[PDB]
Structures are given as structure tokens and as C-alpha cells.
Amino acid sequence: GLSDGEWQQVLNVWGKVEADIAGHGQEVLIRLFTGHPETLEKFDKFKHLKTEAEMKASEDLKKHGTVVLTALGGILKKKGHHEAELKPLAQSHATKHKIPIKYLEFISDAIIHVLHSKHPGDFGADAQGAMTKALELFRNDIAAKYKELGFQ
């Protein structure tokens, strides 16, 4: 649950992402894959990437970063009223991709890391607080659907 002022901060931060969605999406995925190499094994289409240079050179990885961040942005713009948008993603991630909730924690922290890396000094303490709460709400509503499905 976020206040109106917190949502305003989230959507202000998101404007930084929307100016270069593919560059942000690329770096989020590279941070996830290099920090947590077990996450790469869930992607049949990326497991061939052995080095970060190959990851950086991969246009398909940048494409997938765009898909991921476009979906997240659509959810964030609902300011918590995201049941219809979140349900299919929860269902596909539990039943088809088999993504443990832990990996959604990893990607949440990776988003915070990338924002500080690309906008140093321009991602303030209030903005980090609001973004973190928004990613927690997203993860918590996914977790509720995971529990319904019995997925661990």
C-alpha cells in the first residue's frame, strides 16, 4: 500500500527508465545474470551466454529487457490496481517458467542497483523508498498467487 505521494515518486523515477527502456532493461538483466548465475539457467534462449561481453552484445537480451520493463511499467502505472495485469504473469511464471519468488526478489534489488548506477546522485532516498515499496507490493501480490497454486 502506497500513498499518492509515493506513487508520484515511483512514476517520476519511471520516467527515467522510459527515456531508455532498452538500455535499462539490458542492464537489469545483466545485473541479474552476473550476480545470480542460476537465474540464467531458466532461460533456454540465454543459457549459451558465457561472458558478460556476450551478454552486452546480445540484441535478443536487450529485446527481452524491453519486454520485461514494458510489462512492469504497465503494472506500476496502475498504482496498485493491477489484478488483471498481474494474474497472467504470476500464472506463467509459476506454471510455465517455474521462477521461484526468490528470483523476483533478486530482480527487484537489481532494478534499484541499476537506477543508482545510471543516475548517481539523482535517485534520492525518498525515491528509493517509494520504488522499493512498489516492487515489494508487486512481489507480494505474485506471492499470493504462487501460494494459491502451491508453487515453491
Name the binding residues for O2: 64
Among 9, 26, 39, 58, binds ligand HEM (CB under 6 A): 39
Q: Given the rule CB under 6 A, which of 18-26, 64-72, 76-84, 116-124 is the region that contacts ligand HEM?
A: 64-72
- How many residues in the shown chain lie near ligand HEM by CB under 6 A? 17
Q: Given the rule CB under 6 A, which of 3-11, 15-23, 43-51, 116-124 is the region that contacts ligand HEM?
A: 43-51
Residue 149 engages ligand HEM in binding (rule: CB under 6 A) = no
Phi, psi (rounded to 5 degrees) for 3:
-75, 170
Q: What crossing angle do the helices spanning 125-149 and 4-18 adopt, rounded to 10°?
A: 90
d(CA 94, CA 89): 8
Residue 114 engages ligand HEM in binding (rule: CB under 6 A) = no
d(CA 140, CA 72): 14
The binding site for nitrite consists of 64
Cell of 124: 534520492
